[PDB]
Structures are given as structure tokens and as C-alpha cells.
Amino acid sequence: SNMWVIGKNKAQDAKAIMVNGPQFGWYVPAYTYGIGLHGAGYDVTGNTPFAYPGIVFGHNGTISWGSTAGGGDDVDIFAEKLSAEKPGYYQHNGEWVKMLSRKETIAVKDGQPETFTVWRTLHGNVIWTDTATQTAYAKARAWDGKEVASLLAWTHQMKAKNWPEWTQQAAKQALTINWYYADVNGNIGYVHTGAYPDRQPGHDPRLPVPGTGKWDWKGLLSFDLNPKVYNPQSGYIANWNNSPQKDYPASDSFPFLWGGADRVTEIDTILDKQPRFTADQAWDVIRQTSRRDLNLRLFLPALKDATANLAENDPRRQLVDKLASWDGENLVNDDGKTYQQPGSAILDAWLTSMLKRTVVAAVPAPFGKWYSASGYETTPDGPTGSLNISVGAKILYEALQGDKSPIPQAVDLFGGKPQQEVILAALDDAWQTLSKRYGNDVDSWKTPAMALTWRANNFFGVPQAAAKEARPQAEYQNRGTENDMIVFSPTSGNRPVLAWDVVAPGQSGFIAPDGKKDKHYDDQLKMYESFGRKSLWLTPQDVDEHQESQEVLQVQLDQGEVKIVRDEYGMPHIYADDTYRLFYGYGYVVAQDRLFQMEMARRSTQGTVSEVLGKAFVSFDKDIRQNYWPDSIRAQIASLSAEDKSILQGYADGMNAWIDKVNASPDKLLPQQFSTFGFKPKHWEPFDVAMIFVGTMANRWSDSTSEIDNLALLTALKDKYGKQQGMAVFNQLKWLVNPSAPTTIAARESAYPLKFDLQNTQTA
């Protein structure tokens, strides 16, 4: 997910420009949903994942906002001490506390039900039980009990009109998410939002902690500690899942690192090269970064050095010369199947061999395979997500920097041999594999282009469309699933704010019972591929001028009225006078456009897919039910103010108003996929609505930990290198902080004050 916010001092013909490209993968129907809300204090336009009541990507005429995943460490694992004689009890503060438990049965269409029990302790749900050590590992999220509040903070921030008002909602968003701000006066800002634990001294957040009491969190850190910047000296805020600020620690996941090698530098390079950007140039950064090879910039200096004494007759030299004449941009040939230059295939083969010889060799099996990927891994279907610098490559980059790197190399990744020797040896392996395939002349190689697929299964692996709806795209583009731009105070024109977005394949996922696709089923698919965009309307004049349909709806609760106006791309605009009615119109239009997708997202987020699709989804259903506690979500809803509750209730009731019309005349209104898969849509509740957010936002982007795997790795590293050196190798592969990491907030602005204790920890 990427973002670039350009302020007053860096914007040309405008006061501020915001460009967001969140990366969620490619699906049909679209991952995000375009929506306009007007009334009850709301006047907002934009698009949002899974049609959440809160619009994640948008603006309100005064401020614009967006987000990328935060990548912080908000999840810790508590190793609970089990009892030999007491089943279902654990030790906390000298006593034997009983575990909460709940029994679940997964109903299976044409199959056998599957029963199991989910366990929960004061730390969280139990994710794993090791009988040998009598340990139950419990997952503690700093945001547990704040799921519904995080959804409502995203909804209320839509009404903010300045920095203090917006940061007040940013403080109530408990998930690890980067939030961005821009306004009509040219002010830009950034907050790395979330609830983060206040840990005991010597708590290494990369490894599990005993859950007996001595290591329980002292509570949560204050919002004052969260990295934030307002109008940075640089005049821009750029992010591509990189570090928010100097000394700020990343998530404990072993593949996730923030080091000297970071893809955000690709955006920083473009933004620093010129002093001012127009709206069209800011948007063009998408085209540029989408085609950028991320490894050329990192390894070309070492490759030129290793082949400096070679003449042009040497094949290893011919490979580096081909890389040295390349601009790093990948373009597809007229055939639609191959790249114009072979550089990425050369870097892929070289990196794969380099990693086998360096990082993979140093790490004992079966942990070596964790650092073997080159970052180019793809199938004929194309990459399912973004392309990044791999974890192995990030560690290899530190070793290549050597002296320049702040990471102590506790083990020489080059195993005694000089690095030039290893670099030429990997180049020879790359030459051998690539010449066997394309012949001995590098100038004639037509290497395969990465393709893209708009998947008919959601990110969970569950159908959200018939398989036949999957669409191919010849060019893979390392860009957002959607891209949106907001331009504040443009010098040209009679509008104080301009916005655009692209929601492909289209605004609608509706396919009629006879197979007829809606007019807005795929009318944005070609616009996406060609880096085009469509206008986002906010004012009633713009909405009414570009309208295509207009209808009134009578809310079933109070016979009140809601006006729905759809634009030329099918994007609905809701007009209502109270909170309940507003969200009722929203849920109603979601049910008209994305019923089959939302119903499948509902079953995916609650683990009820097998009920309608069969035994294939049983392990998926079980794992979803094991990863949440329904009573906590229901308690969070039950304790909402009447205003916050009307948002969820209105939305659910609005969906039910359309579902009833659908079930009254299925032969004309039932989405075709309900007939293809053999079931009917049913009513939604505020629970269902909250669980779409929890299951697809909190669980997908804010629930990442690999502490148990980290412990297994550290245990093997101590076995190989000894207790002392093994821990120092762990600090070289999975460092807590790396000061050379490119950061969204400049070091000049501020740094993370919280320093961590290395000596004496839970691993002593």
C-alpha cells in the first residue's frame, strides 16, 4: 500500500495533493465500494473496502484522508503455564485461573458437522498448545476490546474539519494503521495510529513472554508516543509500508523488516528529483512506481564492482552491462507476454543463487527456506499482492553495505570468502540457468512479463463471484487495488477541491438471473489498466449534473425518506436527515450492488462458508472461529451510544430492505451467483456489519505475529552458534530496530523516544 501527500511548498497549481494506492490484491467484484454520504453532519465522498460504514479513502470538502497498514508490533504471545491435574486451568499470580471456553459446530453442506472448543485466557485466545512443556500460547492484541470503536473512529473522522478534530478520532483507532491528512489550506499530516502495549522492562517484543503474571503489560502507551507529523519541513509525506519514524519498532513477523533497503525510497527519489508537482504529475508517480524493479538500485553498485576487472567477452560481465544500461522500468512488448528488457529475470536468478550462498547457508534448516525468496516469485496468474524487496534481500543488502550498515554482522554471510567471489559465483549460476532457456545472447532475450488476475475468490480463499468471472490483465502493475487523488484549492477552475478515483472492474458486481451483467459491472476495468481515473463528486450541483438515476426510499422504521442519486459510473450518493436514515440508504445500495460479495464476506468473517459450500471450507471455518471471541464483539456493540448504534443498525436494516425485495421476486432480482452456489441471502444484524470490519481489517492488517516461529528460529540459532552468538545472529536476521531504515517522518522532525532493553530479558 502506498501514499504520497504533497503540501503547499511542494504542490504546483494547488495547495495540497493526496495520492493513495492501497494494495489488497485484485478481485471481482472490486475490493472497495464507492459511496457518497450527505446528511446528519456527514458530507463525504470516496471509496472504502467491503463497503464499511466508515469511508477509508475520501474527503469532505475541507479535509481529505487515507491509509496504509501500520506494520507496528501490537501483538504479543503469552506462554501460559498449564496444570497437569487441572484441564482448562492456567497459572496467573500464584493461582489456578479457569479458562473461558466455547463450543462450536461447523455445519457442512452435504457433509458431516465438525465440533471443537475455543479457549481464551486473560491474555487472549489460545492459538497453540505444546504438551511437552505444558504450555498454552495465547494471542494478546493491544486492540482487543476496541474493534467496534476502531470502526466508529473511521466513521467519525469523516466529519473532522481540521487537524485537532481529526487527531482526536485518530487516537480512538486502535488497529496498527497509518492515517494521512490533507486540507483546503494546504496543511498535510500523518499519524501512525493504534493501541500499543506498555511493556515491562526487558520484554523483547519479538519473542513470547511467560503468562504467569510477571510479564503482563503495564497497560497501553499514550497517543503522545504514536509517531506523527504536521506540515513536515520536507513538504511531503511518503509511505510504502516503511517505518513511520527513526527508532520505531516493526511487527515481530520474521518476513517483515524495516532496514536500509526499502521500496519507499522509490517514491522519495521521484519526489526529491523535482521541487513542485502538479496533480497530473503526482498521479503519474503511480505509473512510474508500478513498473519499477525494486532490486536494481540496491545491487547494481555491488554487481558493477564485482565485474569491474572483466572484459565484455565474459558472460558475467555481459549480464551486469545489460543491467547498467537499463532504466529500471519494466515495459511489456507488443506481444503482451514478454518484457522489453531482461533485467528482472537476471536479478531474480542472481538473488536466488546469492541467497542460497549467504543467508540460507548461515541459517540452519528448516529455517533457511524463510530467507530463500528473491522477491520475484510469481505464477502464470501473476503475483497475488504487491512486489517488495524480500526479507533475505534486505538482510543481504545490510551485509553488502558492511561498514556502512548499523547492523552488527554476528555471522559473516559470505562465510569467509570475499563478497566479490560470491557475487561472481551467483552471476555464473544465473548465466547458466538463463542461457539454457533463452540462448547465449542476452540482447535477444524476451523474458516473461508478470501478468495480473482479478480473482473471483476473496483474499480468504472463498468465492465472492463465480470462477468464470476471473479476469486476466496482461500487465501486472505494482500499484494500489484502487487509486484515488484529492487536490485542494486548485488554481484552475471554480471548485475548491477536486477528487478522482478508479474502482475496477466497476462499481457494481450485479449479474441478473439471466446472466446479464449490470452496466457498471466492468466499465472501469480498461480505465484502471491505462492509468486513467474518473471524477468523484461531493456538492449537490456536481452530483445532480452528473446523475444517471435518482430514487426515493421510505425507511421501514419511521417511514422517513432517503434520496439515492447514482452518478455516470453507478456511484450512489445518499441524502438523509438523521444518522439511522443515512446508514440505511448506504446499506441498501450496498445490497443492490454487492449482495453476493457481502454475503460471502459475512460467511468468511464468521466462519460459516461450509454451511453453504461444503467440506472444502471446514479448516477455514474452524480457524476463523478460533481467531475471535463473539461475546466481546456483542458486548462492544451493546455498550454503544444510541448514535453509534444507529450507524450499525441503519446499515443492517438498509441491507434487509433490499434483501426483502430480492426474496419477494428472485426471478428478476436475485444475484446469479446465489443460484450458481445454491442458497438464498438472509438478514443482517449490527453483529454481521461489525464482523465485516473485524474480519477484513483487524484480522488482515492488524493481527500479525510470528513469535512462536521466532522462538524456534532463536532456539536453532543458539544450537548452531552457541547461546551468545545465536542471539546476536537473531539480531542480524530479525533486528528490533534499524536506524538506517527510510522513515515516513524525517529524523530531523522527531524520533521514537522509547528505547528497548537488550541485556537481561524473558530469554535469560
Segment lying near Ca ion (by CB under 5 A), choices 66-74, 346-354, 465-473, 530-538: 66-74
In whole angstroms, the minimum distance from the beta carbon of 734 to Ca ion comes to 11
Question: Which residue has 454451511 as its cell numbers?
Answer: 611
SS3 for 250? strand
In whole angstroms, the minimum distance from the beta carbon of 205 to Ca ion comes to 4
Residue 523 in contact with Ca ion, rule: CB under 5 A: no
Question: Residue 136: enclosing H or E segment and its boundaries?
Answer: strand 135-141
SS3 for 655? helix
In whole angstroms, the minimum distance from the beta carbon of 624 to Ca ion comes to 22
Q: Which amino acid is at 182?
A: A
SS (H, E, C) 420-483: HHHHHHHHHHHHHHHHHHHCCCHHHCCCECCCEEEECECCCCCECCCHHHCEEECCCCCCCCCE
Burial class of residue 496, CB neighbours in 10 A (0-12, 13-18, 19+)? middle
State the binding string over 282-321 for Ca ion (x if CB under 5 A, else -). Answer: ----------------------------------------
Residue nearest to Ca ion (CB): 252
Site for Ca ion (CB under 5 A): which residue of 22, 44, 73, 375?
A: 73
Residue 675 bears catalytic tag: no
> Given the DSSP bridges, would you call strands 236-239 and 63-69 parallel, antiparallel or unpaired?
unpaired
Q: How many CA atoms lie within 13 A of 603 on its CB side?
A: 27
Strand partners, 384: none
Report the alpha-carbon distance of residue 89 to residue 106 in Å, rounded: 26
Site for Ca ion (CB under 5 A): which residue of 76, 216, 268, 484?
A: 76
In whole angstroms, the minimum distance from the beta carbon of 207 to Ca ion comes to 8
- In the complex with Ca ion, which residue's Cβ is closer, 45 or 706? 706
Which long-range contacts (C-beta less than 8 Å, at least 24 apart) are formed by 543-551?
A: 543/36, 543/567, 543/573
Question: Residue 727: enclosing H or E segment and its boundaries?
Answer: helix 723-733
Of 1, 344, 604, 702, catalytic? 1
Q: What is the Cα 650 distance to its own chain's centre? A: 28
Segment lying near Ca ion (by CB under 5 A), choices 75-83, 164-172, 637-645, 740-748: 75-83
In whole angstroms, the minimum distance from the beta carbon of 197 to Ca ion comes to 8
Report the alpha-carbon distance of residue 723 to residue 148 in Å, rounded: 44
Question: Residue 322: enclosing H or E segment and its boundaries?
Answer: helix 315-324
Which long-range contacts (C-beta less than 8 Å, at least 24 apart) are formed by 196-201?
A: 196/72, 196/73, 196/74, 196/142, 196/220, 196/221, 196/225, 196/226, 197/74, 197/76, 197/140, 197/142, 197/221, 199/76, 201/757
Answer yes or no: are the C-beta atoms of 66 and 124 closer than 8 Å.
no
> Given the DSSP bridges, would you call strands 75-81 and 209-210 parallel, antiparallel or unpaired?
parallel
- In the complex with Ca ion, which residue's Cβ is closer, 527 or 711? 711
SS (H, E, C) 1-62: CEEEEECCCCECCCCEEEEEECCCCCECCCCEEEEEEEECCEEEEEEEECCCCCCCEEECCC
In whole angstroms, the minimum distance from the beta carbon of 706 to Ca ion comes to 9
Report the alpha-carbon distance of residue 552 to residue 254 in Å, rounded: 53
In whole angstroms, the minimum distance from the beta carbon of 385 to Ca ion comes to 23
Report the alpha-carbon distance of residue 63 to residue 668 in Å, rounded: 42
Question: Which residue has 474502482 as its cell numbers?
Answer: 503
State the number of binding residues for Ca ion (CB under 5 A). Answer: 4
Q: Classify the phi-psi angles of 219: left when phi > 0, otherwise alpha if psi is within -120 to 50, otherwise beta.
A: left
In whole angstroms, the minimum distance from the beta carbon of 252 to Ca ion comes to 4
In whole angstroms, the minimum distance from the beta carbon of 256 to Ca ion comes to 11
Residue 205 in contact with Ca ion, rule: CB under 5 A: yes
Answer yes or no: are the C-beta atoms of 110 and 610 closer than 8 Å.
no
In whole angstroms, the minimum distance from the beta carbon of 370 to Ca ion comes to 17
Residue 144 in contact with Ca ion, rule: CB under 5 A: no
Question: Which residues within the stretch 237-256 sit at the binding site for Ca ion (CB under 5 A)?
Answer: 252
**What does each C-alpha distance from 680 to 30, 411, 508 come to in angstroms?**
22, 60, 19
Cell of 525: 476495468
DSSP letters, 543-586, are: HHHTEEEEEEEE-TTT--EEEEEEETT--EEEE-SSHHHHHHHH
In whole angstroms, the minimum distance from the beta carbon of 73 to Ca ion comes to 4
Strand ranges for 312-385 from DSSP E: none
In whole angstroms, the minimum distance from the beta carbon of 705 to Ca ion comes to 6
State the binding string over 543-582 for Ca ion (x if CB under 5 A, else -). Answer: ----------------------------------------
Longest dimension (CA), the chain: 84
Q: Which backbone phi and psi does 702 adopt, to 5 degrees?
A: -125, 15
In whole angstroms, the minimum distance from the beta carbon of 394 to Ca ion comes to 19
- In the complex with Ca ion, which residue's Cβ is closer, 677 or 756? 756
Report the alpha-carbon distance of residue 147 to residue 693 in Å, rounded: 8
Question: Which residue has 434483501 as its cell numbers?
Answer: 659
- In the complex with Ca ion, which residue's Cβ is closer, 197 or 607? 197
- In the complex with Ca ion, which residue's Cβ is closer, 43 or 204? 204
Segment lying near Ca ion (by CB under 5 A), choices 201-209, 297-305, 678-686, 689-697: 201-209
Q: What is the Cα 588 distance to its own chain's centre? A: 27
Closest CA to 550 of 566, 561, 537, 536: 566
Question: Residue 285: enclosing H or E segment and its boundaries?
Answer: helix 279-290
- In the complex with Ca ion, which residue's Cβ is closer, 198 or 329? 198
- In the complex with Ca ion, which residue's Cβ is closer, 140 or 601? 140
Answer yes or no: are the C-beta atoms of 593 and 58 closer than 8 Å.
no
Residues designated catalytic: 1
* Residues at the interface with Ca ion (CB under 5 A): 73, 76, 205, 252
